[PDB]
Every structure is written in C-alpha cells, then in structure tokens.
Design a protein around this ligand. Structure first.
Ligand SMILES: [Cd+2]
Ligand SMILES: [Cd+2]
Length: 33
C-alpha cells in the first residue's frame, strides 16, 4: 500500500523510511500504519 502521506493524497509510495521520497519532497510527516 502507499505511505500515510500518499494515502491522503493518493500519490503512491515506494515504502521506504524514514520519509518516502514524496514526504522528503513536500516535507511532510511521513507515517505508516
Ligand atoms: Cd509516500
Ligand atoms: Cd510519507
């Protein structure tokens, strides 16, 4: 599945920590669940 960030915006995620490339880009709280 996508990370919490790509889950609210739906931008698909690569599933990598700490922050997915999408969170380190827009600088957001990357969380998982
Ligand atoms: Cd993501
Ligand atoms: Cd994220």
């Amino acid at each position: 599945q996508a990370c919490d960030a790509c889950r609210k915006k739906k931008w698909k995620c690569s599933k990598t920590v700490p922050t997915c490339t999408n969170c380190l880009k827009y600088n957001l709280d990357c969380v998982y669940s």
